[model samples]
Target: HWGYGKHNGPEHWHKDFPIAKGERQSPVDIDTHTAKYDPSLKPLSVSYDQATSLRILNNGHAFNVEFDDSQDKAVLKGGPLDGTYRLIQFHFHWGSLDGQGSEHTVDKKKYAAELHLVHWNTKYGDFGKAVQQPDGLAVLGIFLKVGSAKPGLQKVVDVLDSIKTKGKSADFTNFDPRGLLPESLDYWTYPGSLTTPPLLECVTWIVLKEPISVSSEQVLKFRKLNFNGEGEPEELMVDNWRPAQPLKNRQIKASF
Candidate 1:
């Protein structure tokens, strides 16, 4: 693998990984016309063991939590949905080549990046089987921006040094994702599908409208990861973002 970096931004991803070109992509600006209405849904509740055991993989753009386990050890049940789902690994996507970057643009406003919390409906007893169902997956979208420093993000950002070299990964034992959630559980939700490969059509998406920001330096560091095997040791990997997609008659509700 050649690892990720500025030399090969997101645009080049499909060159080697063509499947990515057709995935149900996110981070596209949500075109909601009904205005913001608070949904009766509560913030998705998950157990520490469920959230921590999640395998963390930082693909340079954002973090991804994948759940290939069949035991459903970190499964979540109830809330606004009618079925139970297993917690899968979460990952993020961002822009490369842009100052204010993000995948899911809101009302034309750009953000730093977008985080995705992937899950599978356990209603079918197994995750793999569930992913095949239309109602099998659920993803939570969290936006990032350039702003004041945040101690919360540091918990994750602190480890960037290990993976900054591209294709390099460090063990993140006992890591909890809630540590990165904003104090306010408020969010905007809608019905959508996975923005990546296998673009499953069955997904309930909840995007937190309130974005979290880090200083320019923080963003600068994120752009520093990629294929270290190359001769240039300091080539930054900033601007790995995806263009906003078209919203096809979707309604967005908010949680206040």
Candidate 2:
């Protein structure tokens, strides 16, 4: 049901949700060098034990995980987003190659990659129905960059073989999504829309300014995901990012 291809990236997501032109987007101009704005100093806490069920789904676009975590079941509880939106689905956006991966830009600088942890309010019955509502979702954005080869993302990298081809999905058992979060909870909060489409203007975004590094080898695995549809020969899929939209009248809010 999703479009994954060369011209089908987020850059064209606005076509699916026209009102997104009015929603706020993030990773805006935060003058970290002068310490003029420091949202990282804010207190944001979450409990890993509250995570009930974890699932990894390959929707052909990206490798995403959906889980039910009681700890973060409330939306505004551990964040500045201001509501109890349930964590729904989490996915990634990457480049076909290494050096260029992420979608959102901060002060005109791009990172290696971006991860979106999606959530939905209880308004539309369940997460599924919430996806249909305007103010039904929240996405936590985590940035990934290339760093030293100390540790790797064993959780995601290990599952690469399962969903190598487009539309291929493997059920991953016994995994926790929280393990992927960085130790530093310092984040920038704002009301924004989904980076992808329908480009819904309902999502509340929490973008972590500091990036967590993963080994290059791990990056290779993610880059190797199949781009073509099933039943066709494998084609290397690369650069699945949406272009950054205008801020319009939206303002990004920092926590500190």
Candidate 3:
């Protein structure tokens, strides 16, 4: 398994996962000045059933809130997707300190953190098989700034204590993901890959233009998570964000 450490970090991932050097890599810098606004772009359609939110788990890399995608209970459409994508899971990437840690940057500026809401195309049957194709996954990236504490995120933060250690998991339900989004649905879309290894180039990235607020105190709690499991040496999980990758020839489309 790969980690964001001195030895097996992002830079060394290409050795194990050759696709880490693939063309459509994610976490690319979003330059608004250069992005093309597409008038043809349709409004994004996002519908979720809070009850489908199954559990939260600390998977050494990051804490994931998994959903029950057995049915199209939570689905995303429009924006840049060809078909409905079933909500699978969501996670975050943050730094150990303030003023840094986001995987994707805007006009060269880094945010305090980033949230990824992952979904898979229903046409592909399942997430495991969908990831192998080019248009299989869709990830919505929302930037997090240090400001007033987000009321919508309080529920998620409150449960972190119970899953502080790696491999720890607990049932979490009835949490609406829509509350975590910004008021404006404006965004930028592009083709990209998973930021982590097995860096599959399968995602159609939909990055929100507006960022939500979360207090610095609340942001610090993310760093308190452990990367090691019980009985193993405890390692503070921080700076888990991968660096921005090259844009290659991909053009970014804006839906304003």
Candidate 4:
């Protein structure tokens, strides 16, 4: 029941999911001054087949684009990861308004929104098993800036009208998520937990430094989707991002 609302928001999440206050909690502010450059970190290799993409749905929390994870059709490798991680789904977090969306911040700067490309380590079998291990999830984080229209993004946003309510889904395929990422692969890596509830500390956060631009009109389409399911109190899905967590003493590595 944790949400971005005043009562059930991020501040109240720790009451249910104690791990919300854990040492490796995610969506922390990326301090550029303290982020050490790691030459050991390799350039991330992101490969995807449009056929691997399957459906898009509003999961009550955020709209997710699910993919075929049966085989390693779409995978992420290199960078701070040891082996291949299969892409399972991708989702986004945004604010009611443009200025306060992203889960992860850069030197305290918030983006219009943030994109999470969730991947699981094949070494651990599947996402279920992978979720238990420390190095199980490799989430590729991309910050979305609002400015110019991005043609590639238009294809996905066009489907919003079909899935206006929470839990509603539509057949979504033949799209390459790679195009949604910024051209520069430079990033910041750290050990962190999922921003959502059941906040497991099993993620290797690979956040890109460069943000991709999208038109303001395209960004507004996400707000059109309802947070409540059919016949429920209509709540606009906005400000779904978790606030920045304490960094503790974790070292953030940057690939420049």
Candidate numbers, best lDDT first, in rank order:
4, 3, 2, 1
Q: Which candidate model has the greater TM-score, 2 or 3?
A: 3
The true-versus-predicted C-alpha distance at residue 117 of model 3, in Å, is: 0.3
Give candidate 3 misplaced runs (Cα > 4 Å).
49-51
- Positional deviation of residue 19's Cα in model 1 after best superposition, in angstroms: 10
Model 2 misplaced stretches (Cα beyond 4 Å): 1-6, 10-16, 20-42, 68-76, 132-134, 149-152
From the highest TM-score down, the ranking of the candidates is 4, 3, 2, 1
Compute each candidate's TM-score over C-alphas: 0.75, 0.82, 0.97, 0.98
Instruction: Give candidate 4 regions above 4 Å deviation.
Output: none
lDDT, residue 201, model 3: 97
lDDT of every predicted structure (CA atoms): 0.61, 0.65, 0.91, 0.91
Winning model by lDDT: 4
Could you give candidate 2's per-residue lDDT for residues 20-116 as a string of tens digits?
4654653244334422344443455554445554657666667777665444542433565444666656778878666666777677677778888
lDDT tens digits, residues 70-152, model 3?
A: 98888989987888999999999999876788999999999989999999999989999999899999999999999999988
Tens-digit lDDT track of model 1 for 1-256: 3233445544455666564444344435665555466556765565436544434455544544455456666655444556667676776665563345666777787777777777777777765777677677777677877778766567567777666654556676666666656666556666666664444556777677778776667666666666343355565555555565445555567665
- Model 1 residue 170 lDDT? 66
Instruction: For candidate 4, write residues 61-175 as lDDT tens digits.
Output: 8999999999889999999999999999999998888898899999999999999999999999889999999999999999998999878788789998888898899999887
lDDT for residue 4 in candidate 3, whole number 0-100: 98
lDDT of 2: 0.65
Show where candidate 1 strays beyond 4 Å: 1-27, 36-50, 54-79, 97-99, 227-236
Better of 2 and 4 by lDDT: 4
